[PDB]
């Protein structure tokens, strides 16, 4: 399909970034070629964490999310650092109402359908120019990725519903 406008944005531990890029960038270029995605790495304004942006199709983003998670787990095990590495997703505060639903029922439903635990950063931790919440997903890799697919479906729909009026008028 067409690459979509809203990227998947992950927050990963800085110490695993070198592993994701790999020698002479061959790991990231491999992920890019297998998933047909544009990937970049940058700071998140609000030290031990870095932002990863994946611009792909929905399926390309989900596949890159799984490859990235597998590398981080490989690297956490291989350095005896951790046996789990939670998946952290960045989503604009405007979209997270829809994902959460009334009294968090939509989020419990994703947690139950995917066999994951999900927690969302506090509203009070946003900044004037950083409107992104962090959604922490814990569980097996395959399960975190199913939750990624569900969350990012909801975020993309909320984005397309919010901008539909202003796209028509032009």
Residue numbers in the entry: 191 to 236, 239 to 362
Provide the authors' original text about this structure.
IGF2 mRNA-binding protein 1 (IMP1) is a conserved RNA-binding protein that plays a key role in regulating cell motility, morphology and differentiation in the embryo, reviewed by Yisraeli. At the molecular level, IMP1 regulates the transport, translation and stability of a diverse ensemble of messenger RNAs (mRNAs). IMP1 contains six putative RNA-binding domains—two RNA-recognition motifs (RRMs) and four K-homology (KH) domains —which are conserved across species and found in pairs (RRM1RRM2, KH1KH2 and KH3KH4) that are closely spaced in the protein sequence. IMP1 function relies on the recognition of a diverse set of mRNA targets that is mediated by the combinatorial action of multiple RNA-binding domains.
In order to understand if and how the KH1 and KH2 domains also fold into a pseudo-dimer structure, we expressed an IMP1 construct that includes both domains (residues V194-N369) and determined the crystal structure. The structure shows that the KH1 and KH2 domains fold into an intra-molecular pseudo-dimer,, an arrangement found in a number of KH and RRM-containing proteins including the IMP1 KH3KH4 di-domain. Within the pseudo-dimer, the domains make contact through the two β1 strands, the inter-domain linker and the C-terminal α-helix of each domain (α3), burying a surface of ∼1200 Å2. In addition, KH1 α3 is longer than KH3 α3 and the linker between KH1 and KH2 is three amino acids shorter than that between KH3 and KH4, implying that the shorter KH1KH2 linker must span a longer distance to reach the amino-terminus of the second KH domain. In KH1KH2, after a sharp downward turn, the linker assumes a nearly linear conformation retracing the direction of the helix to reach the amino-terminal residue of KH2. The differences in the inter-domain interface result in a change in the angle between the two domains and, as a consequence, in a shorter distance (7–8Å) between the two RNA-binding grooves, as highlighted by the superimposition of the two structures. A plot of the RDCs measured in solution against those back-calculated from the structure reveals the high correlation (R2 = 0.97) between the two datasets, indicating that the crystal structure is highly representative of the protein conformation in solution.
